[PDB]
Amino acid sequence: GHENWDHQLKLAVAWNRVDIARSEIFMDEWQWKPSDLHPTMTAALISNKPEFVKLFLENGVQLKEFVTWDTLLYLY
Amino acid sequence: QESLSSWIPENIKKKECVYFVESSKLSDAGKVVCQCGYTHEQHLEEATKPHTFQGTQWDPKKHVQEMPTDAFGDIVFTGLSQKVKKYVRVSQDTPSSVIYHLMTQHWGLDVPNLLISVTGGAKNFNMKPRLKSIFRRGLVKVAQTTGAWIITGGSHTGVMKQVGEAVRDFSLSSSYKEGELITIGVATWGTVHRREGLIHPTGSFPAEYILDEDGQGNLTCLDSNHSHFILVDDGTHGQYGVEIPLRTRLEKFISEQTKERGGVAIKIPIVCVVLEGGPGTLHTIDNATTNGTPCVVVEGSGRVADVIAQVANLPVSDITISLIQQKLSVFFQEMFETFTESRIVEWTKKIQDIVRRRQLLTVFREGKDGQQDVDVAILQALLKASRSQDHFGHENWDHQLKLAVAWNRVDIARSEIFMDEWQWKPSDLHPTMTAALISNKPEFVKLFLENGVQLKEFVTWDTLLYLY
Amino acid sequence: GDSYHVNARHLLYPNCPVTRFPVPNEKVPWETEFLIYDPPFYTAERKDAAAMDPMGDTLEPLSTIQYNVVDGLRDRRSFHGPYTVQAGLPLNPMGRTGLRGRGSLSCFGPNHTLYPMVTRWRRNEDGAICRKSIKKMLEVLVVKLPLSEHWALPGGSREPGEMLPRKLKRILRQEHWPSFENLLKCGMEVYKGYMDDPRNTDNAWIETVAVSVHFQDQNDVELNRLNSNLHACDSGASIRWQVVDRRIPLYANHKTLLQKAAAEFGAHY
DSSP states (O other): OOHHHHHHHHHHHHSSOOHHIIIIITSSSOOOOGGGGHHHHHHHHHTTOHHHHHHHHHTTOOHHHHOOHHHHHHHO | OHHHHHHHHHHOEEEEOOOOOOOSSOOSSOOOOOSSOOSSSSSOSSOOOOTTOOOSSOOHHHHOEEEEOOOOEEEEETTTOSOOEEEEEEOSOOOHHHHHHIIIIITTOOOOSEEEEEEOOSSOOOOOHHHHHHHHHHHHHHHHHHTEEEEEOOBSSTHHHHHHHHHHHHHHHOOSOGGGOEEEEEEESTTBTTGGGTOOSSOOSSOEEOOOTTSSOSSBOBOSSOSEEEEEOOSOSSOOOOSHHHHHHHHHHHTTOEEEETTEEEEOOEEEEEOSOOHHHHHHHHHHHHTTOOEEOOSSSOSSHHHHHHHTSSOTTTOOHHHHHHHHHHHTOSSTTTOOSTTHHHHHHHHHHHHHOTTTEEOOOTTTSSOSOSHHHHHHHHHHHHHSSOOSSSHHHHHHHHHHHHSSOOHHIIIIITSSSOOOOGGGGHHHHHHHHHTTOHHHHHHHHHTTOOHHHHOOHHHHHHHO | OOOOOTTTSOSSOTTSOOOOOOOOSSSOSTTSOOTTOOOOEEEOGGGSSSSSOOGGGTTSTTOOSOSSSOBTTBOOOOSSOOOOEETTEEOOSSOOOSOEEEETSSSSBOOEEEEEEEEEEOBOSSSOBOBOSSSBOEEEEEEEOTTTSSEEOSOOBOSSSSSHHHHHHTTTTOSSHHHHHHHHTOOEEEEEEEEOOTTOOSSBOEEEEEEEEEEOOSSSTHHHHHHHTOOOOSSOSEEEEEEOOTTOOOOTTHHHHHHHHGGGTTBOO
8 A cells, every 4th residue: 555655754754854755755656635644744743843834734734624623632 | 696507507508318229338337328328227317218219329419419507516626625616517519609708707707818728648647857847837927927828628637637736836826816827627528537416406506526536437537726617518428539629619719809908909819838748639739730820849758749849850851751650669669569550651741741830830949949938938939920920011010019018028029029120110109008008017118118209299189088 | 687586596595594605697507607516405304204205315316206207196397398307306497596405395396386366356436447547456365374474375385286275275265165166266377387486496496387267247256255255264364355566565476476467467567
């Protein structure tokens, strides 16, 4: 499956740098859908890295569709 | 909004089959298929009747009928955006004036200054990144600053994908007038994947449409970045190419309307730009440039574009069939064995007839020479094609100036219209100056004053009364 | 990029702490002169036992079975051709392996095994075949062993003839229905002959048969009863269907069979 593409993104967000992810992870050849970004966005939101939040918003994640009840309870 | 939902089914029709003639070839799990096999045991949603005749080989001229349209309205993609996109289903043959009256009045689009018809290969492909960024930036630049329509197939594959990508990049920018980029998409209603959720009569103004790549058969799904959708319908499920005989008629009808602003009036110019392409795209290029429309090909990233890019400078009759045979074998190299020798004679004839007319055809020459940007290449190609058009007198030079002032940009006019070779006298600028004065463009006023128009000689009594 | 058995030439023979001789790409075949070739003779400790050939020390004249011919219960004859014999020992028909002896294999020469593959199309929710950019998708049934760390094809050593499916699938399929799938085992073949493997010495190598039973209709027929012949949990971890891809996580040389299998149907890669 395509879990390797999720794994590369988790690696790029575990390191702090964002130039790699916009440089070659989000180049092409994945056809990701924005529901498949909701885990790592959470990890980008807790550890206070706003650059990855801006990058995920530029690839179109919907904040109204993202903040559920349980995700909010987990964030608190 | 209620007037639109009244007006649309009163004017536009759709097609449907009424006669069940079960076809021989069983479909992929769709063995009940009556030569259209749409959704029943029959190719029908009507009375499955003998229809007083067992007419075998159900002719579409004899079988299908027209009815009012039940599929119009507005759409929104489930979970990809929040904007709404208008869409309609039309029949195979509606008069283009009806569609034009729909697009101007009810959807609320102004008359465009330019009509760009991008075409290319349906299959997916890739290109170099520098060429990709240059092409995307130039296309969004010219379509934003000109006030132009972009018309193409509205499917998710191929060239039709990539242009939509460029539009999404403008949605990343969204500096001012986000509704300026208006792209329409013409697609076949029969080959749309999850289209069954759209069919709701009397208006479907919220219409959630999901999509899934690879969760579909030979039929395809729509693109998501296009702004309006027109789905032509014949009444056939598995058929391609029904969109082509309406798209050309619509383009030729739009390219004859006259837009009048200020004092001046022009006819809307039309250009076609091609990408990677295939076999039929070359025939489409030839059929377009026979009528006098210009054409701009892109050097690089072409299974059929790079052929014309390489052969563009060799003279006529220098091209031989062995030359095109080795070019086809080096560039295609996959279907190149599959091509017969009875069609490369056809392709020599077509390419000789294309490169014969050195005026309308224009290669891009990416990077090497004349590679300022994409937009100035398209505009220079359009002006060069309008220049070589025949004329009794110097009214063509007036026409190029009226075209350059209808578009907002002034760099073109000072760049090449006022270069040399006209010997204009300043009394021949008084109409367009008026049109530059009403629509509040001071740059053209400064340019006309630099070429020496006398304001004391310009403002008559009647010109003043017309200005008020 | 000459096609040599690079998995057999791979250093450090499995589960036995010995190395093989360095055999470069020039001196692989027997026709090439290679003077410094000193392969250490190594066999398994359980290679001198029962059923399997006791020729681990075959300098003794105990090596007396018929070569390139069916010598009774051991059909010691290659699918590729008549293998040459030196000192009563077979030489590898593809080239030098850098290690002499019986290895962990059963008998000398070839060791005939059988690899069946079950192929079906990949359906969507509606029931049409899914597609790549041009080609289609194929689904194969694959077994994960609990102590292998690799998904592998359900094929075993062909120590019996028609119970070699059962020898592969005693843990997998059934016992009663295993005769029924054995009737269904008469299908189409893809490849037969020498197979690369890290357990290849200069004397004992592996040859196989690749039969390919295919399911055209994805509703019932053989597909429902083969799913109904699931007596799966006997001595294995898990079995499941799996979509074909180049990045299919599998055992190494099994993917060479599938790259030859998709050509017989036109899948993607």
